[PDB]
Amino acid sequence: SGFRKMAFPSGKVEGCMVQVTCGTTTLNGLWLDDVVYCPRHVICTSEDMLNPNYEDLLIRKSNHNFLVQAGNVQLRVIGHSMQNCVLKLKVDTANPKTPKYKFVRIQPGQTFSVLACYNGSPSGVYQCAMRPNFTIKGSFLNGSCGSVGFNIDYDCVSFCYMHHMELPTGVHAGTDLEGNFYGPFVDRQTAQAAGTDTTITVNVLAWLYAAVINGDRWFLNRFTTTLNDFNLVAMKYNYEPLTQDHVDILGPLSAQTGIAVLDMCASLKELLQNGMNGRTILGSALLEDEFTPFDVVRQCSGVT
Amino acid sequence: SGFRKMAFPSGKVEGCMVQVTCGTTTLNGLWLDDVVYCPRHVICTSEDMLNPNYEDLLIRKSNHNFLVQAGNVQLRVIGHSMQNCVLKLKVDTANPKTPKYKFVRIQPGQTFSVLACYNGSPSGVYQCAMRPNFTIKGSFLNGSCGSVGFNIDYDCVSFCYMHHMELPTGVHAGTDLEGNFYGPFVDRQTAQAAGTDTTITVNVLAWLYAAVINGDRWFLNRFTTTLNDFNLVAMKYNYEPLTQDHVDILGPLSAQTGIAVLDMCASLKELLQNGMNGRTILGSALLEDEFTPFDVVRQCSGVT
Ligand SMILES: O=C(O)C[C@H]1C(=O)O[C@H]2[C@@H]3OC(=O)c4cc(O)c(O)c(O)c4-c4c(cc(O)c(O)c4O)C(=O)OC[C@H]2O[C@@H](OC(=O)c2cc(O)c(O)c(O)c2)[C@@H]3OC(=O)c2cc(O)c(O)c3c2[C@H]1[C@@H](O)C(=O)O3
Ligand SMILES: O=C(O)C[C@H]1C(=O)O[C@H]2[C@@H]3OC(=O)c4cc(O)c(O)c(O)c4-c4c(cc(O)c(O)c4O)C(=O)OC[C@H]2O[C@@H](OC(=O)c2cc(O)c(O)c(O)c2)[C@@H]3OC(=O)c2cc(O)c(O)c3c2[C@H]1[C@@H](O)C(=O)O3
């Protein structure tokens, strides 16, 4: 029992983290086979970041202009390609620790683990969700760019995020490993700002189910609601709409707890309308939306 | 910016996790050099756990009665010793992935990362604190016993916890790697119950400093307090006493923020007396006490 925001074990990603230096700019890179993927703005200074012409900075960059360090070992950059906002640095050595991996583009509301790295060295791992506004609420200091987000399925590391930018609001924006930013964000400073975020309703419901599974049941009311009526309430509290797909995804948790999703929705509706009156759920005084139904299932089962 | 409950990268611990089976009981073991450390109750059935005579179950256990699997590879148990509540299984192969490591006994209030494992396979990593009552609020399902807690300092893994028991209250108890339980807990079911827990004040203050560093400053009041007066308030809210040692430990955060510890204490006092009035701090509607001053410093700096 117990329910924690759990990240994936990071070892298989730790073994892929390298440091990429281009001039004075040092960020992290992901070394998979003989390619290191890193944010293209490694070629930028902080001053370049206002409105950088990347293929201009890059076209005046050579392969030798990219310095990749893995641990205490330098990899020669023997090719450089820009794919969207990621630099693919072909290196002279394939990473022996390249796990089985996939590059995936996650959907808003999905969660992944971030291995925060500085200078190619892993500092910490934490779980987070792709917000509906395509930001992530991470913990990224200067030099964490290129830190990646991932999910692990058995033996396969699905890299879904590479950290590129802290927006002026202090949330974080990045790309998939094909260098396509999540959301309307760009690797330049600009009036670029995060759009309004919303609460991931299906995750809140999953976490309420997690709460029930862990015995924190006080918020369970005696009512049910329709999906439409719940969504009217959801909307008022800046919660994403709950779709029938979400309802179906929550099916296993409903089955485990016996609580029909629409009944849980009624409970959530009441939590939204009435608040938590100083109570907590799973040690939180807020409704948590960074656990997907699958996270809840995994954590409540022994998924390794 | 951003501040997350971050765990240590788990790779160096993942490489030490093995499965230890004794009969039908399978739990996790820590494989360091040629020893696998695991909870002695691997020799227990669930029925044995009410009041197990361990050196009785063990004395009728042979070296061959212990089955250790590392990945898909069996290690022969060529010796077995019980040290307090841990079984040290001498195995025929030293773990090639044994990191530099130390066994440390942490103090209540200190935090560590847990790599939750089932059947020797890492499932997730999360950070937690040794509560003042020597429990941990983890996420442990059956079969997670032997999962370890650790901190990483540079290259050294300090193992400080091995998971042994879920208490009937749903919190978790365990030992250091010498098998000495944290707290008055025993590896037997009994009226054994967690003593009253308290909030780790110095960690709350550290997290308030983290909040200030991250720009969440609304709770900063204009007052100061004495340590004694703060402690009177702390006491009323089941907060641990703040010692001058704590104050001194918070010095670096005070220096960084300019907020004298006793001024922060005044702010915390007001938070305790008045609540948060629906506001959050670092996205939490409760005061968080699972970040030590060192965690805050590490996370707010780039410590890898
Ligand atoms: O086992 C451990 O405990 C860790 C240990 C490890 O995992 O080894 C795997 C792993 O690759 C896969 O898992 C894999 C990749 C695929 O592409 C693929 O198709 C697969 O089927 C598999 C795979 C395998 C076995 C399974 O049972 C399974 O389920 C799988 O999926 C498998 O045989 O993989 C090879 C092996 O070697 C490495 O891969 C290559 O060498 C390689 C990669 C390429 O992309 C490529 O093009 C190429 O030519 C070579 C990878 O190494 C690490 O990833 C690693 C990372 C760290 O961070 C460490 O610390 C670390 C390691 C390895 C070792 O170095 C160590 O001691 O530690
Ligand atoms: O480097 C990587 O990226 C991972 C890679 C790795 O770290 O190797 C280290 C590591 O041990 C230390 O770090 C270490 C231990 C000490 O006791 C000690 O005194 C030390 O000074 C050091 C050390 C070292 C270097 C530093 O720069 C540094 O700062 C250090 O502190 C160093 O040379 O260590 C040896 C090396 O080999 C292994 O240790 C032994 O073989 C050993 C252990 C014993 O206890 C023992 O009695 C014995 O006779 C042998 C350990 O291996 C892993 O721990 C490991 C774990 C995983 O989970 C992986 O996935 C994984 C690995 C290794 C590899 O297998 C892989 O590819 O991946």
Written in H, E and C, the secondary structure of B192-245 is CCCCCCCECHHHHHHHHHHHHHCCCCCCCCCCCCCHHHHHHHHHHCCECCCCHH
Amino acid at B302: G
Ligand showing the shortest atom-to-Cα distance for residue A153: 1
Interface test mutation site (partner A, options B126, B145, B155, B292, max chain A beta carbons within 10 A): B126
> How many angstroms is it from B101 CA to the middle of ligand 2?
10
Q: Measuring from atom 14 of ligand 2, which residue has the nearest CA?
A: B100
Distance between B114 CA and the closest CA of chain A, angstroms = 9
For tokens 């070394």, the residue is: A31
Q: Measuring from atom 4 of ligand 2, which residue has the nearest CA?
A: B97
Domains located in chain B, CATH noted: 1-14+100-197 (2.40.10.10), 15-99 (2.40.10.10), 198-301 (1.10.1840.10)
Q: Would you say B20 and B38 are in contact if contact means Cβ atoms under 8 Å apart? A: yes
Query: Measured between alpha carbons, how far is B264 from B281 in angstroms, rounded to an integer?
Result: 14
Six-digit token string for B98: 């044994």
Q: Would you say B88 and B102 are in contact if contact means Cβ atoms under 8 Å apart? A: no
Q: Would you say A31 and A75 are in contact if contact means Cβ atoms under 8 Å apart? A: yes
Query: Measured between alpha carbons, how far is B207 from B298 in angstroms, rounded to an integer?
Result: 12
Identify all chain B residues contacting A299, using CB atoms and an 8 Å cutoff: 123-124, 139
For B191-213, b/e burial (b = at least 16 CB within 10 A) is: eeebeebbbbbbbbbbbbbbbbb
Long-range contacts of A32-35 (CB under 8 A, 24+ apart): A32/A95, A32/A98, A32/A101, A33/A94, A33/A95, A33/A98, A34/A90, A34/A91, A34/A92, A34/A93, A34/A94, A34/A95, A35/A88, A35/A89, A35/A90, A35/A91
Q: Measuring from atom 17 of ligand 2, which residue has the nearest CA?
A: B100
> How many angstroms is it from A19 CA to the middle of ligand 1?
21
Reference B304, options A118, A303, A226, A55; nearest CA is A118
Bridge-based pairing state of the strands A73-83 and A86-91: antiparallel
Distance between B98 CA and the closest CA of chain A, angstroms = 14
Query: Measured between alpha carbons, how far is A47 from A187 in angstroms, rounded to an integer?
Result: 13
Query: Measured between alpha carbons, how far is B214 from A137 in angstroms, rounded to an integer?
Result: 12
What is the stated resolution of the deposited model, in angstroms?
1.4
Distance between B60 CA and the closest CA of chain A, angstroms = 30
Bridge-based pairing state of the strands B100-103 and B156-166: parallel
Query: Measured between alpha carbons, how far is B63 from B65 in angstroms, rounded to an integer?
Result: 5
Report the atom number in ligand 1 closest to the C-alpha of B11: 60
Query: Measured between alpha carbons, how far is A48 from A42 in angstroms, rounded to an integer?
Result: 10
Ligand showing the shortest atom-to-Cα distance for residue B11: 2
Whether A5 and B5 lie within 8 Å, measured CB to CB = yes
Choose, from A128, A145, A160, A265, the residue flagged as catalytic: A145
Reference B152, options A146, A10, A6; nearest CA is A10
For tokens 């971050």, the residue is: B6
